[PDB]
From a paper:
These observations provide a structural rationale for preferential binding of Shc to IGF1R. The additional binding interactions with the phenylalanine in the Y+1 position should allow it to outcompete IRS-1, which lacks the Y+1 pocket.
Insulin binds with high affinity to the insulin receptor (IR), while IGF-1 binds with highest affinity to the IGF-1 receptor (IGF1R)2. For both receptors, ligand binding activates intrinsic receptor tyrosine kinase activity and downstream signalling cascades, which in turn regulate gene transcription, glucose, lipid and protein metabolism as well as cell growth and differentiation. The NPEY motif within the juxtamembrane region of the IR has previously been shown to be critical for the recruitment of receptor substrates, including Shc and IRS-1.
Author numbering:
A (entry chain B): 1001 to 1009
B (entry chain A): 161 to 265
The structure:
Amino acid sequence: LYASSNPAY
Amino acid sequence: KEVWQVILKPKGLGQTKNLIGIYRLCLTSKTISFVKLNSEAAAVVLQLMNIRRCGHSENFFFIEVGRSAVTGPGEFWMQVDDSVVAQNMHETILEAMRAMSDAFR
């Protein structure tokens, strides 16, 4: 799995 | 404005909200809309700001959504044709999220 956190959350 | 055709899986909010099958996922600079094929109404319109995480694994793309989303918290899993399409979705949506946070500065 490749996951990114949302900087605009 | 990107549009992808995806299969929404039972996994997560798909089963819970009966959002399963072929959808078009439409991206603006602020929202993602899920429209069932042949429907004239968006089943759900998500704000990018209420998405916690996104990512992919081979030909699967996921969105995890937070507590203020229109759906409430949970995950969407969608199958596409291959990992080239899934990576594209990841990179494009990530790009829009970064554009959103940088627009403030």
